[PDB]
Design a protein around this ligand. Structure first.
Ligand SMILES: Cc1cc(C(=O)Nc2cnn(C)c2)no1
Length: 119
């Protein structure tokens, strides 16, 4: 029932994501010189360094907010892909499965801890 435990859990999950080769295209903002039309399709760019910096700045109140930003990395990849068989998008799908597998207990434990706090 530790209301604050999600933060270190998210830091460790981000460390695992950075060690994963599938995160390479998503570790820093999409390079607008390499993809000049990126902002014509994507309204809100997001990447794992921005997520880690937001967390470290104390700018996430809950793991649900971090999860919304991580999911935005994957939805941006899906929206920008010219094909469902593209390399970067295919890496996003595996990384998304890995993230969802690991974030599930972080969200469950936090929501349970908050319910206990407000019992
Ligand atoms: C670090 C880092 C950022 C990128 C980058 O532009 N990645 C990216 C994501 N989607 N598209 C179309 C490109 N590569 O390495």
């Amino acid at each position: 029932y530790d209301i604050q435990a999600w933060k270190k859990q998210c830091e460790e999950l981000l460390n695992l994501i950075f060690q994963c080769e599938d995160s390479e295209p998503f570790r820093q903002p999409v390079d607008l010189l390499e993809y000049p039309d990126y902002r014509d399709i994507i309204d809100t760019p997001m990447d794992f360094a921005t997520v880690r910096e937001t967390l470290e700045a104390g700018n996430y109140e809950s793991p649900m907010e971090l999860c919304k930003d991580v999911r935005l990395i994957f939805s941006n990849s899906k929206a920008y892909t010219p094909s469902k068989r593209s390399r970067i998008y295919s890496m996003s799908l595996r990384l998304s499965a890995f993230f969802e597998e690991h974030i599930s207990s972080v969200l469950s434990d936090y929501k349970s801890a908050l319910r206990f706090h407000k019992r």
